[PDB]
Amino acid sequence: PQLPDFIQNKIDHYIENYFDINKNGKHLVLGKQASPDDIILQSNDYLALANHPLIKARLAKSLLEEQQSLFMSASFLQNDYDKPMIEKRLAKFTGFDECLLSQSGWNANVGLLQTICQPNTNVYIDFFAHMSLWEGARYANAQAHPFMHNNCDHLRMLIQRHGPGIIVVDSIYSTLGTIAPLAELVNISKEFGCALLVDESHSLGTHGPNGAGLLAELGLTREVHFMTASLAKTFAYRAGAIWCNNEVNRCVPFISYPAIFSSTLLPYEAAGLETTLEIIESADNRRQHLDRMARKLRIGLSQLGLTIRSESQIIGLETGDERNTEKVRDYLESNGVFGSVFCRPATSKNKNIIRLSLNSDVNDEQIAKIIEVCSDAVNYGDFYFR
Amino acid sequence: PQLPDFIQNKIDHYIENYFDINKNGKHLVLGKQASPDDIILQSNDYLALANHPLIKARLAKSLLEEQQSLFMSASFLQNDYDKPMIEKRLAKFTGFDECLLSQSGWNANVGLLQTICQPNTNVYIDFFAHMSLWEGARYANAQAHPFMHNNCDHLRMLIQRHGPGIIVVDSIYSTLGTIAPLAELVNISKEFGCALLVDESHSLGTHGPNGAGLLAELGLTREVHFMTASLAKTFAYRAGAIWCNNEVNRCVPFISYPAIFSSTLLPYEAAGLETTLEIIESADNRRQHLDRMARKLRIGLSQLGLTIRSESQIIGLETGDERNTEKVRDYLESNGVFGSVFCRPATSKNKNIIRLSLNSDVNDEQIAKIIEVCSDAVNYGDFYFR
Numbered sequence: 047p048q049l050p051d052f053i054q055n056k057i058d059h060y061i062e063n064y065f066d067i068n069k070n071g072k073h074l075v076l077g078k079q080a081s082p083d084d085i086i087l088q089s090n091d092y093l094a095l096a097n098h099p100l101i102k103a104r105l106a107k108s109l110l111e112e113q114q115s116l117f118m119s120a121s122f123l124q125n126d127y128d129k130p131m132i133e134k135r136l137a138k139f140t141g142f143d144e145c146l147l148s149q150s151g152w153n154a155n156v157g158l159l160q161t162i163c164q165p166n167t168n169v170y171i172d173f174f175a176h177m178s179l180w181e182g183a184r185y186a187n188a189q190a191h192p193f194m195h196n197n198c199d200h201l202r203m204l205i206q207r208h209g210p211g212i213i214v215v216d217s218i219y220s221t222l223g224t225i226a227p228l229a230e231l232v233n234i235s236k237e238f239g240c241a242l243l244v245d246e247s248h249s250l251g252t253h254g255p256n257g258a259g260l261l262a263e264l265g266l267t268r269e270v271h272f273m274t275a276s277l278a279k280t281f282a283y284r285a286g287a288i289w290c291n292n293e294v295n296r297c298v299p300f301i302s303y304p305a306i307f308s309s310t311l312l313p314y315e316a317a318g319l320e321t322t323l324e325i326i327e328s329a330d331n332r333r334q335h336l337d338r339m340a341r342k343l344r345i346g347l348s349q350l351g352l353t354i355r356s357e358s359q360i361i362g363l364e365t366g367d368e369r370n371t372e373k374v375r376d377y378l379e380s381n382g383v384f385g386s387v388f389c390r391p392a393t394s395k396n397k398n399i400i401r402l403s404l405n406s407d408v409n410d411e412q413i414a415k416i417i418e419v420c421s422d423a424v425n426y427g428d429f430y431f432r
Numbered sequence: 433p434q435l436p437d438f439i440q441n442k443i444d445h446y447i448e449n450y451f452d453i454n455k456n457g458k459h460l461v462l463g464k465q466a467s468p469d470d471i472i473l474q475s476n477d478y479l480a481l482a483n484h485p486l487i488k489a490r491l492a493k494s495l496l497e498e499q500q501s502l503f504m505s506a507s508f509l510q511n512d513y514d515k516p517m518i519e520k521r522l523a524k525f526t527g528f529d530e531c532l533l534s535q536s537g538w539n540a541n542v543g544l545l546q547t548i549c550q551p552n553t554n555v556y557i558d559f560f561a562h563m564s565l566w567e568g569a570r571y572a573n574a575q576a577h578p579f580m581h582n583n584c585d586h587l588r589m590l591i592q593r594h595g596p597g598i599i600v601v602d603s604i605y606s607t608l609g610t611i612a613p614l615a616e617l618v619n620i621s622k623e624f625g626c627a628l629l630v631d632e633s634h635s636l637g638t639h640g641p642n643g644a645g646l647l648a649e650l651g652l653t654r655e656v657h658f659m660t661a662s663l664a665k666t667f668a669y670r671a672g673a674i675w676c677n678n679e680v681n682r683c684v685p686f687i688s689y690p691a692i693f694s695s696t697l698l699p700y701e702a703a704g705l706e707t708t709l710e711i712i713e714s715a716d717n718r719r720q721h722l723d724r725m726a727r728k729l730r731i732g733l734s735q736l737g738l739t740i741r742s743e744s745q746i747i748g749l750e751t752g753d754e755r756n757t758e759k760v761r762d763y764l765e766s767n768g769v770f771g772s773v774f775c776r777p778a779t780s781k782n783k784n785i786i787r788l789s790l791n792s793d794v795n796d797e798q799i800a801k802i803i804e805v806c807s808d809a810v811n812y813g814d815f816y817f818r
């Protein structure tokens with residue numbers, strides 16, 4: 047049937063201004079198809095566990111077991127005997143008191159914020175913190191106060207003005223790969239009587255003792271109120287989790303709308319995560335190699351005069367406007383380097399990022415090639431870098 | 433660390449008013465543990481497919497295959513070669529032009545509404561429509577105009593007053609099991625130049641030719657703009673889908689925040705759905721049996737004086753306030769009948785429901801037993817039904 051004018055107008059306008067403008071007629075994030083020979087730096091699977099035979103075996107085994115039909119809200123599954131062992135193990139892993147499974151990192155953040163916020167609750171959020179955190183705050187009708195990226199001085203002034211609130215940060219930032227000043231943030235939380243929420247999606251598994259994370263690495267675990275993470279990065283699974291050093295996870299399952307009104311992870315999924323955790327705990331070798339390759343790439347690109355703000359395995363090439371970003375993308379892909387285009391609504395219109403996500407399967411030769419491709423891009427490329 | 437007052441006060445109040453007041457000290461939804469002999473009416477797996485040997489085998493096999501590391505946004509996977517066969521099959525199944533997979537039914541609704549709504553778009557939503565639709569409208573900053581349940585007069589008045597917009601309904605309602613007046617809603621949409629969105633979460637698989645849904649059953653497919661569904665009901669899988677009789681699914685992947693910022697389903701998950709679809713297509717006998725059992729139950733309960741608004745496999749026992757609901761729940765569970773308590777925020781505080789979700793494994797003896805238990809419950813004097 048015919049669409050009403052206001053919907054048709056929106057779709058017509060969108061296709062013109064987001065698909066039709068680009069050379070290939072597709073959205074800016076969609077370039078050319080990658081060949082087997084190309085270097086792919088797009089996946090969040092940092093320790094290259096997507097195809098791990100032990101994970102696949104345990105997941106298949108658990109699925110083939112007699113399946114109880116648990117197609118329902120997790121609200122109904124909160125009796126002690128119905129809660130999955132993975133929660134207790136992830137809590138022990140990170141050093142937090144309690145863990146609660148969620149269907150996504152997005153839902154973990156939205157759910158936690160809905161539970162701990164009242165309307166007009168002060169939420170002090172890093173300008174570059176994940177969209178799920180910004181949205182979580184917005185859905186709860188909290189008062190969001192952005193602070194300049196990693197700027198503790200700016201943060202202090204905001205809390206001085208508005209009073210006690212929730213300080214919200216990524217441990218490692220999704221677009222830039224910068225690291226939050228977690229120690230200073232803990233100090234500030236104490237200095238002003240705030241709660242701290244740290245999203246460790248990009249540090250859990252890759253950082254800390256046995257991959258326990260950045261809070262564990264810095265010995266700050268017992269001074270942080272909340273941590274969250276997508277399990278779709280290093281844990282290579284479509285899920286999320288909320289950790290609390292308090293009783294909040296007793297309440298989340300009955301308060302969070304995504305936790306109430308969206309279906310639970312099935313029991314076999316929880317079992318697969320148990321194996322993933324064991325593999326991650328022992329993956330000292332992969333973590334070290336990733337760390338070394340990441341440092342090499344950061345040093346190599348910084349030498350070219352490129353702005354590389356990263357301190358991690360996530361490297362952000364800052365490519366300015368969309369037209370320029372299309373050029374940089376086309377050049378890199380033409381020379382066998384496939385990153386991820388980060389544009390609006392993930393960034394502002396004129397501050398786009400081509401994100402290179404490193405994983406432990408990337409070797410010295412590939413690292414050298416990336417620097418080589420970027421060097422030719424700086425010197426011979428008909429485009430700029432911010 | 434101890435929580436600051438602004439959180440602690442909320443949590444304290446919540447525990448007091450939602451956990452402490454109940455006899456067992458737990459949330460209202462949490463009763464006693466069921467025995468293997470008990471009648472369990474809690475799962476949305478209407479055709480009892482959770483333990484189907486063929487589905488399990490297809491998933492495990494596709495899981496054990498060589499997996500590509502696709503842990504990223506689905507926006508990066510919108511090339512024709514990256515889009516799954518299940519989407520084309522599901523579109524043919526329902527008779528809709530195009531289908532787009534989502535991570536949940538919740539995400540399907542939230543994403544679609546974000547794509548087709550502008551700020552202040554009129555959204556005419558049934559009082560009892562699923563929370564995901566209410567929230568999808570709220571996130572999009574749409575103007576919600578709630579209409580009395582299944583009340584086309586109230587809807588007509590609202591659209592005359594506020595103008596063209598989007599009419600949003602469940603085909604079969606999640607708490608009451610009532611059926612939307614879909615033919616009349618199609619007429620109203622045409623008369624007033626509105627778009628119609630129908631959530632078929634509770635009719636897809638159970639109703640229509642080969643389980644194609646209620647729109648298909650009524651021959652209304654080609655007159656409806658959008659249909660959505662959780663695949664976590666009859667399809668017994670943690671996913672959702674958006675169907676369009678237009679070009680909107682071209683745009684959803686790049687606009688919807690869950691589609692953009694949350695990880696996609698993996699290829700093996702899609703293959704599992706293909707097998708599930710085939711089984712559902714041929715499950716005529718299961719559909720027929722469920723339909724017969726559900727009618728038998730509604731007849732049996734309604735003659736006892738209970739209000740039973742249902743016309744489907746979802747049967748809502750209307751139990752009034754929370755104190756009454758607790759007593760009803762306890763009686764039913766003590767006598768071997770386990771439904772799901774639906775209370776706030778899913779219902780009003782004084783209009784709680786104990787939902788009986790029937791499935792095709794339920795037999796005549798069990799239906800007779802439920803009727804017997806409720807017959808004795810009516811005469812017991814400890815509580816009431818509405």
Ligand SMILES: Cc1ncc(COP(=O)(O)O)c(C=O)c1O
Nearest residue numbers: 308309536537538562633662664
């Ligand atoms: C009518 C209706 N729509 C959407 C959903 C969302 O389903 P899902 O569990 O796949 O998120 C459900 C609730 O779970 C539902 O009952």
Ligand SMILES: Cc1ncc(COP(=O)(O)O)c(C=O)c1O
Nearest residue numbers: 150151152176220247276694695
């Ligand atoms: C920092 C951060 N937090 C949370 C999420 C949400 O992850 P998920 O894909 O599991 O919804 C992501 C985005 O993918 C992320 O990068």
Ligand SMILES: [Mg+2]
Nearest residue numbers: 090220221693
């Ligand atoms: Mg990310």
Ligand SMILES: [Mg+2]
Nearest residue numbers: 307476606607
């Ligand atoms: Mg439901």
